[PDB]
Amino acid sequence: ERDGLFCARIFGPVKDYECLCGKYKRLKHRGVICEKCGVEVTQTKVRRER
Amino acid sequence: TPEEKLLRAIFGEKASDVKDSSLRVPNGVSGTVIDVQVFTRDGVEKDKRA
Amino acid sequence: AAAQVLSSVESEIGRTTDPVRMYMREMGTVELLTREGEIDIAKRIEDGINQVQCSVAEYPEAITYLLEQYDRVEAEEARLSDLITGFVDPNAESIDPELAREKFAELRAQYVVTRDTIKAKGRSHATAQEEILKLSEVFKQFRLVPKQFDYLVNSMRVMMDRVRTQERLIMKLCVEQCKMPKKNFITLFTGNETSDTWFNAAIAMNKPWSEKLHDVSEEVHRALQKLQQIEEETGLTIEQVKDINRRMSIGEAKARRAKKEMVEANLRLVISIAKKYTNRGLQFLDLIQEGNIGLMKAVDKFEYRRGYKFSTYATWWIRQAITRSIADQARTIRIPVHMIETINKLNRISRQMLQEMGREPTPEELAERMLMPEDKIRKVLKIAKEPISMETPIGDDEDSHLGDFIEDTTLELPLDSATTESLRAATHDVLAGLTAREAKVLRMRFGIDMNTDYTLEEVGKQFDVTRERIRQIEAKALRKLRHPSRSEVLRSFLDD
């Protein structure tokens, strides 16, 4: 869920360089902020510290 | 990574969507197979094995 | 009147923190009401609702806002939406536009014959007062569905909050600056209501405490300009609006104390119907709270002319509340209500089939009976499963618990990272061994040592206009890299 306890917008991305939307793959997209789910494309192991 | 994609472009292996998830023994203690028992499904065809 | 028993109870209680005993010791004060005793409570609810509706009907611009909303819903030539269903639907002591015309023509006629006679001989003339009372008796015939009715009540609430906010701002600024007593303030605020003649009278009275007034007058007779704007937009006096608001407060307070007396005498029906619905789905205090919310929602829509008892009508609402509470979360995951309904239906059919036949509920007979496809039955039987907790004591000792046998697959192997670090240096040595411009093309083509991978048009805009020569360079690079002597160290990396 977007506003959830296991969310990807606030509580860290579940995968590296990938949105909750499932659209912002294909790594060429760098540093952009999504308009549907709003997940910043960062590296892994950030989910444990947010 | 783009290095492995460059290797795929040079050598030319398609690498289709079939994973190698066969049953392997981790640090396999060798020996002799006694008997193979296979369960079947009421809806799925048994397909020649049992 | 019952605290003397509760004091002797709490003298025995050794500080019990459990809210169940606490709840059923605070709710036991009010005894059971009689059968015909709530008829007078319902009549007080009737009197309060009628007083609030008379306070709305005495407000003259409610018809103006209603005609404005009716013009906005009538404007774009074709509407049969859900907003039209929120309108009147008049009750007696399926909506067509022909009856709307037939019942709104005389309403528009009374509006245009009432608006033109406002300036005739006075603001509160007796013939004009009879015309306002006649327009109010016409307006009380058509009563709204409470959605748009509560919308207009909220609009009147916002207008009242604006008027009382301006009046409170004036009063608090006067008390903060000049410190005026209420005896010299309330009389002038009741009497004058129009101009600054009370201000000139306060100047004409000597009153040496009022000498700190000239540096604040530029806000004093600026805050009254907003009241002049309100009187220009409305055309009403302050005292009549205060009387209407006081009658509306009384009509809300009577129904409020009636709801208090209803809930304090019917918490025990809620707990009696709620203690039989405690089948271990969730902790029952939330069920008690949801039953109280369902009691409130059943009291808010209770009728008197039916003649039946309130418990039969409230039972369906409180069972709906308990049903949506037990189907709201019900797990650690989110499952919709219709899925819970289908799972309960399949469980009852499987239980009846195991009772009749005597063996396991095979889903083929369920698919033949309920005419459902078999894969849908497999999907419903596969999704419905409760998750397992994170402790799960397996052995007898306190050593075997979880945090074991479960691994995380995100952390990958160090050997793969070592082969990646060797492959990086290998491709760096391959690109260094070739031509430097070939190395720059192979780096900026597929994204090696760059952030983004440039397309063919972007490489054409950067390096050179000819794009077929770039493909010839790529083909020559592939022909030079198919040689095994330059890729013998890369043939071992082919299996990965």
XYZ file of C-alpha atoms in Angstrom, chain B residues 1-13 15 41-44, chain C residues 364 378 423-424 427 442 446-448 478 481-482 487 490-491 493-494 496:
36
model
C 24.725 -5.014 -15.840
C 25.765 -3.501 -19.210
C 28.972 -5.590 -19.130
C 26.985 -8.837 -19.233
C 24.697 -7.324 -21.882
C 27.816 -6.499 -23.916
C 28.972 -10.104 -23.430
C 25.541 -11.292 -24.612
C 25.791 -9.008 -27.654
C 29.282 -10.283 -28.522
C 28.872 -14.026 -27.964
C 25.170 -14.342 -28.758
C 23.324 -16.571 -26.277
C 19.103 -17.084 -22.473
C -2.913 -34.952 -9.180
C -6.629 -35.480 -9.813
C -6.837 -32.551 -12.241
C -3.362 -32.588 -13.793
C -15.530 -30.848 -7.866
C -8.756 -23.478 -6.252
C 34.924 -8.599 -15.064
C 35.131 -4.810 -14.642
C 36.545 -5.180 -19.775
C 31.826 1.176 -26.690
C 25.861 0.839 -23.898
C 26.342 3.003 -20.800
C 29.787 1.874 -19.641
C 32.191 -7.174 -32.983
C 36.013 -9.106 -30.463
C 34.908 -12.487 -31.851
C 38.652 -13.147 -25.259
C 36.308 -13.932 -21.143
C 35.364 -17.456 -22.301
C 32.848 -15.812 -17.842
C 30.433 -17.154 -20.481
C 27.641 -16.834 -15.749
